[PDB]
């Protein structure tokens, strides 16, 4: 909070109109480079556990 | 320096021209333009200034992380003798991940830098795409360039994204070498039964050549029309002009028909931009939906028939 | 691409899927290649096609519209233009046979020498001065350092006698380079532009060939309005009357070789 | 029929030979000399085509004989003949209709030519056109010659002319090596990567953002000059598009050419000479 | 360049605050971290 | 922010805003990559191993 | 301090908008270039000695 | 170049004080890390 | 610098900045290119003898 | 060029000098090198 | 050295400047080639021999 | 300087400057060539027999 | 050319011997070397 009332000049140098549909972009990949991510790999939340009968009285 | 409009024969200077006026926000060109004799004999002899914010800056550092980790590796098989190094250059290269590791993160050692390397190098391409997407809005531009650059994006991410992923398994993708990858689509064709009856391979090919067509005649035909000031397209293209007046007629009495200075352009794009367009999907297809284009071609009736003068047997089915 | 399918998969199923959106884009290309041009004229032969067609396979596109930048009019595509005029008789009353142009065909503006009334204005630059000038008004343009300077060179001609001598080059200062050479006959002692594009250099003898044209007829070249620069309409009117030359220059020329 | 300004350009002269007698125009097409020429080659050829699709790989009524345009094939004489004319139906029509081609491709440029002569424009198109028609006069004279056999030529059939492609490249096994192959290829994506930029840039400055002018060279130059730096040039790109084109095709008939008469070993090998350096 | 030793002085400080700020915030990220699963 | 003070003297050479992008992008990368690297070896915490397997409880 | 002596001339030929840039470039690259290098050698820490094997502990 | 002796000699000087900030930063660096890892 | 007493004349055929500059370079380069090199085949105190324990001993 | 006989050594002399002092940095770093593997 | 009695000439037809930068590569390259090329086969004192086997020695 | 007295007449044709430096590239190249070629084939005294085996033999 | 007959000779005559040098040269490392392996 202490250099909360010192960083408000940020907007004299950097244009706003750039700065924010640049990051709305910045983060729509990220977020979805997230899920990619962790669903390839770490877990996969709709074909690992359940509902185990989706596949497994789906498959059959 | 022949005069064919091939070589110009007298060159002359101006003051380094910054580019034009940009918009607000925009950070201003830098860069101070350099003059080329030899290099402004073949076209235009100013150099830069370069554009370079957010977007170029965090791409230019992007992918150049991708390429030292490349290069790095390289340089590593090689155990660093730089000797070697240049001598295997071609044939060095940084090999995917082992298929004993599907998607999942790997080891820095088994596959691990490639992915790494891989998605340093995807964003990197994707990041660019956008930092052309700025500097064409920045000048009013269309987003012509982003269309095409995107539509060879396409068929990059094929290589990778869509069909590999689509496979569940980082084998089914090209490596980071100059010769090795010869081999990846070597191999790849020889896996799927011959690309040469691939449907969109074909397409594509028809692309490749195409598009080398074209320029041949375009870039010909604004040449041999150079005289009457056929270069200068956009003039052209507004208000129509002496050189685009036979520059067509041509055409027009050699085959038939023809298009206007600006049409074809049009046509050059599509028959460019529709190259990797068909190229992402003839790979998209390949080990997905279809493993074998031959028997798929003649499944359909288009493998040619031949005699037979020449024949093996088969030991298994003998045996 | 048989008639008769007996086979059906994914891989065919995205095949055709393309060919519709191909047979459409040559279409849509197509009609774009008609915004300059058609209508036709006649009828010499009637419009070869595996369809005929009233004109074409595709009806011609609607009417874009161009904005050009400041202090210009506005350009429309396709746009219905006025009959032009043909300074030359019909070499035989059958379709298609050729025109023989009246007069001297070096100015009888048929042909080679033929060019369309260009806008009788002048192309700028971003800013809004004449985009081609002389080196006379371009202030900062100045011969590459190393390369030989055209200025003071004696243009000679296709004959091979001399025409006259350089006094001036006209640069570009949109595109950095030289276009037009401002040439001094010797006969009629005016001045007249020579286009690079027909413009050839002999650094040794310090000269200018030209085979388009010989070193007489540089005399009566399509005199500029504004020596200070050079208009669209004469512009394309100039180096047009070179062409001529490329084709009546010499009986030679276009009398056939075998 | 003509268009809008056509009348005004259709002089008569600039002819090479006989051009007087044929030199009319029919339709939007021109004939004089070459002009009767190429197609007194395209009907006896385009129907020696297709009699091959009629009679076919043995006869018209064997089971081979197909109309099906991607099966459709007609393959050259054996390596046997080398330079002698086999049985029209033995290799015969190939050989015949071949020469059919260079008539219509060869006399197809020289009818550009005079074509050009009568625009007075550049004689560009048609010496680029050259190139094209050169390439193929490698992969049926050239080749084959310094081979001795033209069974050595590629078989005229949609899909058939691929395999001669997939042996010949096998022939050298992994023929991604050749050294002007590589070359050629990457001029070839070179050109197709020159279009997609050249093409694009134009439409991009003749038809802007909405209430936007047409654009100027002005732009251009620094457009690319804030991607990449430099901008090569207006004419510039029409010069090198045209060199590329043209680089590619010519690389690449270097490509087929050294491959079998100047090297039958295998390409991946051709490197060593790289390797057997005594440098490392 | 550009501007004067007076704004920017200013500059200094104000991005200065927030310069160790991303010192702190990531000094707190490995200090935690260490603490979780401690490396080396 | 002690030897802050003669610090303070660069801002008058060069355009602060470059070493501000050129930064925020600079640690773009370092960050995407290190949990890469990281991730990719000492511990793929997201499905190297701990916790409860997603593949044990998971895929039965 | 020696040296230190007649080295300021140094800044009237070379300008400084040059040495402060390529200089962090340089120490970046060079940097990166070591933890990497040295990574990939032995002495590696993320996963080459301790933390001893917990993976495989925590995992199954 | 671009300046004079003055604006140069001092440059120099802060210039200075500021690579042996690194050296100093750096060494004392390599000394932690090679107390721990121990290379050679 | 003893008979290099002579050789002042150098300057004025050999530009300064670029001299300087440049050289800097190739240094940089070489600098690295050798370590490299040598670090090849030579000897690789990063993996070849101690006190490197933890790699091995640390590893199984 | 673009410089005279009288910096000529200026510039001579201060940058010879220097270039010494790297040339026996160096000596001295192939030095401690031998002493600790030694080569050939 | 004799033979050199008119060989001052020289620096009259070929351009100093020139001359001298391109010998300044020439020999620069030169040199780098031959140590290259000498080290490979003939004598590679780094992995090639003695006089210790920190590898050979300190690896095993 | 026997043949300079009927030969002389060759420099006003030939450009002195082009064929001076022209000739120097050649022959350095040849030079570099030849080595190459000679030392590849015929004997690579480099790599190939004597002085000795110092390297492998010396060593191991 | 770019000069007389005068010149010419000035020129041809330094150039010349200087270039015996050369063979000289060769021709000494030539034996040099037939001295220790005469190839053939
Ligand atoms: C270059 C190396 C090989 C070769 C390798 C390949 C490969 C590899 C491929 C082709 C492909 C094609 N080749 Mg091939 N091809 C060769 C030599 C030829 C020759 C020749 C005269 O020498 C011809 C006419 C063709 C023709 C063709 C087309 C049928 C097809 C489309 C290419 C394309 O789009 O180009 C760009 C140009 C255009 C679209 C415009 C004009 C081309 C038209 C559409 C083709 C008409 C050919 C026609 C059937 C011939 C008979 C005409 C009669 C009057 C009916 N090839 C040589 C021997 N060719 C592609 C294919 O799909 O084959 C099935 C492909 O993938
Ligand atoms: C196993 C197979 C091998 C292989 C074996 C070969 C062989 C074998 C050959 C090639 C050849 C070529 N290969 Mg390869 N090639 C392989 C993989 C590749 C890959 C790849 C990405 O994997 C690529 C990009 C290429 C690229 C190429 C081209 C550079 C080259 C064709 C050149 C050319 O321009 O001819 C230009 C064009 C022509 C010769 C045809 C002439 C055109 C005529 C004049 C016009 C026809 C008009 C027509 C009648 C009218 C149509 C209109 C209708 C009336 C409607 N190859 C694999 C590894 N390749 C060929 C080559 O090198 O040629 C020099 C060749 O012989
Ligand atoms: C590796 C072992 C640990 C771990 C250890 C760490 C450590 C250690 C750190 C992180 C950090 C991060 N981790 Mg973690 N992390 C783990 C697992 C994860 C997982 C996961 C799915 O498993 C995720 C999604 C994350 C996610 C993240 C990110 C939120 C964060 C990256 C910050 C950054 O560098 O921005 C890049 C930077 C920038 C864009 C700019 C710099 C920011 C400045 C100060 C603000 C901008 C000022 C600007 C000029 C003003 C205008 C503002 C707007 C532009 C308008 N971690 C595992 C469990 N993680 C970092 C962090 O967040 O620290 C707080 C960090 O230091
Ligand atoms: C292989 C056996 C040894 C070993 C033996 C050696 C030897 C032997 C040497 C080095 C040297 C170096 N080693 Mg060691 N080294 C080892 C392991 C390492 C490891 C490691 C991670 O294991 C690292 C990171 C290093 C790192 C380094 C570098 C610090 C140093 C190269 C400096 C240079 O290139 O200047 C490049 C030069 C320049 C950029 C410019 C020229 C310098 C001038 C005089 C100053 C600049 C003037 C300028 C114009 C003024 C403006 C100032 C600024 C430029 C703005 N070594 C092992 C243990 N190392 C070299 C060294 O220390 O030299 C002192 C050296 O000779
Ligand atoms: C093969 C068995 C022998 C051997 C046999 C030979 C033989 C036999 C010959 C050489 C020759 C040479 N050998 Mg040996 N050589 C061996 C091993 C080596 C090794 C090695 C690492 O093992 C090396 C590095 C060399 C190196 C060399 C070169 C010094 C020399 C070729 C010079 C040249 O091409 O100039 C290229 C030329 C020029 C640049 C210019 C032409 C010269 C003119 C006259 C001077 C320039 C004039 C100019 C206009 C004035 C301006 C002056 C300045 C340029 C500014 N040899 C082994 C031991 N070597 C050649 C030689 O030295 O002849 C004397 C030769 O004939
Ligand atoms: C470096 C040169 C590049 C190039 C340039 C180029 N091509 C050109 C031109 C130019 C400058 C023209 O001016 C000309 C054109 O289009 O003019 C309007 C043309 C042209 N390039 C063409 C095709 C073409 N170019 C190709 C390549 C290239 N063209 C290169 C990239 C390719 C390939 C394989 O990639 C093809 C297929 C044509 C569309 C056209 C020339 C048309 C022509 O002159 O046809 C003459 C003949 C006939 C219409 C009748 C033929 C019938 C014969 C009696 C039988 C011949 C049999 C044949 C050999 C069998 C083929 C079977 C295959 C299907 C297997
Ligand atoms: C099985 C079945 C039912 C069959 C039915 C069969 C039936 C009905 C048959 C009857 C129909 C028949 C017989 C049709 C015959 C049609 C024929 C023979 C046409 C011959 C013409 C011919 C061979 C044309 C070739 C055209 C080709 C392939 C061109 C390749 C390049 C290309 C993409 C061109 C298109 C764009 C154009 C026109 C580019 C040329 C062009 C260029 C290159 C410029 O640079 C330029 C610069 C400035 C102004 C204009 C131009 C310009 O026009
Ligand atoms: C009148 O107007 C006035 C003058 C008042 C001004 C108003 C001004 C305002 C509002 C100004 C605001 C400015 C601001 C808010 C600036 C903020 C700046 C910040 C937050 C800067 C932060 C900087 C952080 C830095 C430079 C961090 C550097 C980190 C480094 C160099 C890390 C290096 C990491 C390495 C080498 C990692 C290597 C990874 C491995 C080891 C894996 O590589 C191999
Ligand atoms: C007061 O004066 C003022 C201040 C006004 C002006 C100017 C003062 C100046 C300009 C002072 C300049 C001083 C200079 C210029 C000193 C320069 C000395 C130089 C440049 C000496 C260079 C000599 C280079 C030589 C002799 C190179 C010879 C190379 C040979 C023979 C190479 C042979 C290579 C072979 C055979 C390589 C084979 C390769 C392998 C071995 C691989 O083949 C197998
Ligand atoms: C008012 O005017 C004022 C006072 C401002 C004028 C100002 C004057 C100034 C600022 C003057 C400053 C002058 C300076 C600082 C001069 C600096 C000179 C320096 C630092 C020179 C450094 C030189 C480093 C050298 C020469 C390193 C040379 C290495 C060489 C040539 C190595 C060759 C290596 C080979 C051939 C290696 C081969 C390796 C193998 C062959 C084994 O690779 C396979
Ligand atoms: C040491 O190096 C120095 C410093 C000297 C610099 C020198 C560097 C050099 C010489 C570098 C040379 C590099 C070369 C020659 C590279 C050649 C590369 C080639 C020939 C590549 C060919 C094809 C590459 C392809 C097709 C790559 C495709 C990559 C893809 C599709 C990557 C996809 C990545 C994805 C989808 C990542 C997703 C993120 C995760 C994995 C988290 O999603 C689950
Ligand atoms: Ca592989
Ligand atoms: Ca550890
Ligand atoms: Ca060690
Ligand atoms: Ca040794
Ligand atoms: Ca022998
Ligand atoms: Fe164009």
């Given at each position: 909070?202490?250099?909360?009332?010192?960083?408000?000049?940020?907007?004299?140098?950097?244009?706003?109109?750039?700065?924010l549909?640049?990051?709305?972009?910045?983060?729509?990949?990220?977020?979805?480079?997230?899920?990619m991510?962790?669903?390839?790999?770490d877990?996969?939340?709709?074909?690992?556990?359940?509902?185990?009968?989706?596949?497994?009285?789906?498959?059959? | 320096?022949?005069?064919?409009?091939?070589?110009?024969?007298?060159?002359?200077?101006?003051?380094?021209?910054?580019?034009?006026?940009?918009?607000?926000?925009?950070?201003?060109?830098?860069?101070?333009?350099i003059?080329?004799?030899?290099?402004?004999?073949?076209?235009?002899?100013?150099?830069?200034?370069?554009?370079?914010?957010?977007?170029?800056?965090?791409?230019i550092?992007?992918?150049?992380?991708?390429?030292?980790?490349?290069?790095?590796?390289?340089?590593?098989?090689?155990?660093?003798?730089?000797?070697?190094?240049?001598?295997?250059?071609?044939?060095?290269?940084l090999?995917?991940?082992?298929?004993?590791?599907?998607?999942?993160?790997?080891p820095?050692?088994?596959?691990?830098?490639?992915?790494?390397?891989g998605?340093?190098?995807?964003?990197?391409?994707?990041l660019?795409?956008?930092?052309?997407?700025?500097?064409?809005?920045?000048?009013?531009?269309?987003?012509?360039?982003?269309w095409?650059?995107?539509?060879?994006?396409?068929?990059?991410?094929?290589?990778?994204?869509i069909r590999p992923?689509?496979?569940?398994?980082?084998?089914?993708?090209?490596?980071?070498?100059?010769?090795?990858?010869?081999?990846?689509?070597?191999?790849?064709?020889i896996?799927?039964?011959?690309?040469?009856?691939?449907?969109?391979?074909?397409?594509?090919?028809?692309?490749?050549?195409?598009?080398?067509?074209?320029?041949?005649?375009?870039?010909?035909?604004?040449?041999?029309?150079?005289?009457?000031?056929?270069?200068?397209?956009?003039?052209?293209?507004?208000?129509?002009?002496?050189?685009?007046?036979?520059?067509?007629l041509?055409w027009?009495?050699?085959?038939?028909?023809?298009?206007?200075?600006?049409?074809?352009?049009?046509?050059?794009?599509?028959?460019?931009?529709?190259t990797?367009?068909?190229a992402?999907?003839?790979?998209?297809?390949?080990?997905?939906?279809?493993?074998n284009?031959?028997?798929?071609?003649?499944?359909?009736?288009?493998?040619?028939?031949?005699?037979?003068?020449?024949?093996?047997?088969?030991?298994?089915?003998?045996? | 691409?048989?008639?008769?399918?007996?086979?059906?998969?994914?891989?065919?199923?995205?095949?055709?899927?393309?060919?519709?959106?191909?047979?459409?884009?040559?279409?849509?290309?197509?009609?774009?290649?008609?915004?300059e041009?058609?209508?036709?004229?006649?009828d010499?032969?009637?419009?070869?096609?595996?369809?005929?067609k009233?004109?074409?396979?595709?009806?011609?596109?609607?009417?874009?519209?161009?904005?050009?930048?400041?202090?210009?009019?506005?350009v429309?595509?396709?746009?219905?233009?006025?009959?032009?005029?043909?300074?030359?008789?019909?070499?035989?009353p059958?379709?298609?046979?050729?025109?023989?142009?009246?007069?001297?065909?070096?100015?009888?503006?048929?042909?080679?020498?033929?060019?369309?009334?260009?806008?009788?204005?002048?192309?700028?630059?971003?800013?809004?001065?004449?985009?081609?000038?002389?080196?006379?008004?371009?202030?900062?343009?100045?011969?590459?350092?190393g390369?030989?300077?055209?200025?003071?060179?004696?243009?000679?001609?296709?004959?091979?006698?001399?025409?006259?001598?350089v006094?001036?080059?006209?640069?570009?200062?949109?595109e950095?380079?030289?276009?037009?050479?401002?040439?001094?006959?010797?006969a009629?002692?005016?001045?007249?532009?020579?286009?690079?594009?027909?413009?050839?250099?002999?650094?040794?003898?310090?000269?200018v060939?030209?085979?388009?044209?010989?070193?007489?007829?540089?005399?009566?070249?399509?005199?500029?309005?504004?020596?200070?620069?050079?208009?669209?309409?004469?512009?394309?009117?100039?180096?047009?009357?070179?062409?001529?030359?490329?084709?009546?220059?010499?009986?030679?020329?276009?009398?056939?070789?075998? | 029929?003509?268009?809008?300004?056509?009348?005004?350009?259709?002089?008569?002269?600039?002819?090479?030979?006989?051009?007087?007698?044929?030199?009319?125009?029919?339709?939007?097409?021109?004939?004089?000399?070459?002009?009767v020429?190429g197609?007194?080659?395209?009907?006896?050829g385009?129907?020696?085509?297709?009699?091959?699709?009629?009679?076919?790989?043995?006869?018209?009524?064997?089971?081979?004989?197909?109309?099906?345009?991607?099966?459709?094939?007609?393959?050259?004489?054996?390596?046997?003949?080398?330079?002698?004319?086999?049985?029209?139906?033995?290799?015969?029509?190939?050989?015949?209709?071949?020469?059919?081609?260079?008539?219509?491709?060869?006399?197809?440029?020289?009818?550009?030519?005079?074509?050009?002569?009568?625009l007075?424009?550049?004689?560009?198109?048609?010496?680029?056109?050259?190139?094209?028609?050169?390439?193929?006069?490698?992969?049926?004279?050239?080749?084959?010659?310094?081979?001795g056999?033209?069974?050595?030529?590629?078989?005229?059939?949609?899909?058939?002319?691929?395999?001669?492609?997939?042996?010949?490249?096998?022939?050298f096994?992994?023929?991604?090596?050749?050294?002007?192959?590589?070359?050629?290829?990457?001029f070839?994506?070179?050109?197709?990567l020159a279009?997609?930029?050249?093409?694009?840039?134009?439409?991009?400055?003749?038809?802007?953002?909405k209430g936007?002018?047409v654009?100027?060279?002005?732009?251009?130059?620094?457009?690319?000059?804030?991607?990449?730096?430099?901008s090569?040039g207006?004419?510039?790109?029409?010069?090198?598009?045209?060199?590329?084109?043209?680089?590619?095709?010519?690389?690449?008939?270097?490509?087929?050419?050294?491959?079998?008469?100047?090297?039958?070993?295998?390409?991946?090998?051709?490197?060593?000479?790289?390797?057997?350096?005594?440098?490392? | 360049?550009?501007?004067?030793?007076?704004?920017?002085k200013?500059?200094?400080?104000?991005?200065?605050?927030?310069?160790?700020?991303?010192?702190?915030?990531?000094?707190?990220?490995?200090?935690?971290?260490?603490?979780?699963?401690?490396?080396?």
């Amino acid at each position: 909070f202490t250099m909360n009332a010192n960083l408000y000049k940020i907007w004299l140098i950097l244009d706003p109109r750039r700065v924010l549909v640049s990051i709305v972009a910045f983060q729509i990949v990220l977020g979805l480079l997230i899920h990619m991510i962790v669903l390839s790999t770490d877990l996969n939340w709709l074909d690992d556990n359940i509902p185990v009968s989706y596949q497994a009285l789906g498959k059959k | 320096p022949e005069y064919q409009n091939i070589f110009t024969a007298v060159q002359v200077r101006a003051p380094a021209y910054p580019g034009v006026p940009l918009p607000k926000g925009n950070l201003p060109r830098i860069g101070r333009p350099i003059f080329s004799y030899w290099l402004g004999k073949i076209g235009d002899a100013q150099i830069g200034p370069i554009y370079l914010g957010l977007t170029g800056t965090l791409s230019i550092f992007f992918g150049l992380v991708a390429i030292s980790i490349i290069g790095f590796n390289m340089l590593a098989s090689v155990h660093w003798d730089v000797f070697q190094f240049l001598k295997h250059f071609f044939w060095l290269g940084l090999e995917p991940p082992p298929p004993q590791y599907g998607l999942r993160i790997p080891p820095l050692s088994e596959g691990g830098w490639w992915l790494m390397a891989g998605l340093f190098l995807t964003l990197s391409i994707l990041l660019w795409w956008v930092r052309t997407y700025k500097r064409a809005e920045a000048l009013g531009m269309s987003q012509h360039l982003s269309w095409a650059f995107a539509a060879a994006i396409f068929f990059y991410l094929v290589l990778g994204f869509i069909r590999p992923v689509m496979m569940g398994s980082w084998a089914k993708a090209v490596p980071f070498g100059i010769f090795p990858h010869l081999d990846w689509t070597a191999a790849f064709s020889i896996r799927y039964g011959n690309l040469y009856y691939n449907p969109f391979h074909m397409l594509s090919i028809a692309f490749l050549y195409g598009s080398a067509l074209l320029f041949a005649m375009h870039g010909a035909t604004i040449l041999s029309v150079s005289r009457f000031g056929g270069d200068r397209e956009i003039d052209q293209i507004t208000h129509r002009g002496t050189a685009a007046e036979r520059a067509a007629l041509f055409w027009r009495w050699t085959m038939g028909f023809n298009v206007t200075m600006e049409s074809i352009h049009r046509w050059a794009w599509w028959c460019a931009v529709l190259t990797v367009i068909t190229a992402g999907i003839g790979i998209l297809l390949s080990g997905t939906v279809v493993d074998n284009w031959y028997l798929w071609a003649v499944k359909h009736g288009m493998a040619p028939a031949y005699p037979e003068v020449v024949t093996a047997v088969n030991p298994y089915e003998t045996a | 691409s048989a008639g008769i399918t007996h086979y059906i998969d994914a891989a065919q199923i995205t095949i055709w899927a393309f060919w519709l959106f191909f047979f459409g884009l040559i279409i849509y290309l197509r009609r774009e290649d008609k915004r300059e041009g058609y209508p036709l004229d006649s009828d010499r032969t009637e419009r070869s096609g595996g369809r005929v067609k009233v004109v074409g396979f595709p009806d011609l596109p609607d009417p874009k519209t161009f904005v050009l930048p400041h202090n210009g009019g506005t350009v429309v595509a396709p746009r219905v233009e006025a009959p032009v005029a043909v300074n030359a008789t019909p070499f035989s009353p059958a379709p298609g046979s050729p025109l023989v142009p009246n007069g001297d065909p070096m100015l009888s503006g048929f042909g080679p020498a033929a060019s369309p009334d260009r806008p009788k204005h002048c192309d700028l630059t971003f800013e809004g001065l004449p985009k081609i000038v002389p080196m006379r008004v371009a202030k900062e343009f100045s011969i590459a350092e190393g390369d030989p300077d055209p200025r003071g060179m004696t243009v000679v001609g296709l004959d091979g006698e001399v025409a006259g001598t350089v006094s001036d080059v006209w640069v570009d200062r949109s595109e950095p380079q030289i276009r037009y050479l401002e040439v001094e006959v010797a006969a009629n002692k005016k001045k007249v532009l020579l286009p690079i594009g027909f413009s050839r250099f002999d650094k040794k003898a310090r000269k200018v060939k030209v085979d388009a044209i010989k070193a007489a007829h540089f005399a009566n070249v399509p005199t500029l309005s504004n020596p200070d620069q050079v208009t669209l309409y004469e512009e394309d009117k100039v180096c047009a009357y070179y062409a001529g030359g490329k084709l009546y220059a010499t009986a030679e020329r276009a009398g056939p070789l075998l | 029929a003509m268009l809008s300004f056509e009348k005004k350009y259709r002089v008569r002269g600039g002819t090479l030979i006989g051009g007087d007698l044929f030199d009319f125009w029919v339709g939007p097409f021109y004939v004089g000399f070459f002009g009767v020429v190429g197609f007194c080659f395209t009907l006896l050829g385009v129907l020696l085509i297709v009699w091959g699709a009629t009679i076919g790989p043995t006869g018209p009524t064997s089971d081979l004989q197909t109309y099906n345009l991607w099966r459709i094939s007609i393959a050259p004489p054996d390596l046997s003949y080398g330079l002698r004319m086999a049985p029209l139906t033995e290799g015969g029509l190939w050989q015949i209709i071949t020469i059919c081609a260079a008539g219509a491709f060869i006399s197809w440029a020289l009818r550009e030519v005079e074509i050009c002569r009568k625009l007075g424009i550049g004689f560009h198109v048609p010496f680029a056109f050259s190139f094209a028609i050169g390439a193929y006069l490698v992969l049926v004279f050239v080749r084959p010659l310094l081979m001795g056999a033209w069974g050595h030529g590629f078989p005229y059939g949609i899909l058939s002319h691929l395999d001669w492609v997939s042996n010949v490249g096998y022939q050298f096994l992994h023929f991604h090596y050749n050294p002007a192959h590589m070359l050629a290829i990457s001029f070839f994506f070179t050109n197709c990567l020159a279009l997609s930029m050249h093409g694009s840039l134009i439409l991009s400055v003749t038809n802007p953002q909405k209430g936007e002018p047409v654009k100027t060279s002005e732009h251009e130059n620094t457009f690319f000059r804030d991607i990449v730096g430099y901008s090569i040039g207006a004419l510039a790109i029409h010069r090198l598009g045209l060199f590329l084109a043209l680089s590619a095709a010519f690389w690449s008939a270097v490509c087929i050419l050294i491959s079998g008469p100047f090297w039958t070993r295998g390409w991946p090998e051709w490197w060593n000479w790289w390797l057997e350096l005594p440098l490392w | 360049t550009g501007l004067t030793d007076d704004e920017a002085k200013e500059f200094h400080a104000i991005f200065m605050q927030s310069m160790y700020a991303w010192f702190g915030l990531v000094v707190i990220a490995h200090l935690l971290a260490w603490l979780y699963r401690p490396w080396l």
